[PDB]
Predict the 3D structure of the following.
Amino acid sequence: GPGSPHGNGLLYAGFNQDHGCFACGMENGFRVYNTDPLKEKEKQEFLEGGVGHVEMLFRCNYLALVGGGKKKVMIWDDLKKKTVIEIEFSTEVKAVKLRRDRIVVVLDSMIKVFTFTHNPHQLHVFETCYNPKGLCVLCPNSNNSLLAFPGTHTGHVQLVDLASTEKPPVDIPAHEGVLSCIALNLQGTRIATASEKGTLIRIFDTSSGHLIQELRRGSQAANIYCINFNQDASLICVSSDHGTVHIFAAEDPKSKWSFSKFQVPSGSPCICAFGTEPNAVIAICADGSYYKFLFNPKGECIRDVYAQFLEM
């Protein structure tokens, strides 16, 4: 009985590519929500072993699930409502990423890439640094198969084009310190990264590896928990493990510092993404609380929605 941090069964929460849905991995299965307006869309509460990581690929009606036991990847067919592919590993799976034609499995010190077939065939293995958080982004766009992940050298990001594997990877010396957070924009053209120091968020071009914007979260260290771009990557939001969410101008900004910030009253970690409307940010906490805040560059953030999403 390892339980859950909040005693509510929630082991994992994450957004899909455009943040219109989020999924929770629970001790008894998984749950999927429409993000905004908040709506429960699927609840599986009778999956033995639970689910500790959930990846969504609704465009193909699939999810990828990591069993609570951490050694099985299960491809869930969301029309059939069942697992149709299982891959077992001899080490703990930290994350899984999907696109239409690839299953990407993130282990502690390597990333394995498979075909998305009834019998997955391993195509590539990329060594990483130790990667306990399972950092890895995979663009699902038809015309952008970017895979990016922490390189073996501390602070570096490796960028691979799964569509053109013979071209050499791009090696970004993103930070001096251990990487803690990596995020991809919706177009797959920009990645944002933070080290465990968490004072500076850096945005890089995914073709050249060049640094395009550095943002300052603060002068003191923080544990960065989530980063996400808005729809056109004109803004990013950044959350800490204390539940503070900063909103930055990402492109030729007035300031390197955030122009708006809010903090969820639990003081606990949240994931964050922009809502359906461009002046709103969604924050979701493992304690089961959902928040939608409005923002204005010259005003305080105000709370538009509060909900306990595990009560639908």
Summary: The chain has one domain: 1-312.
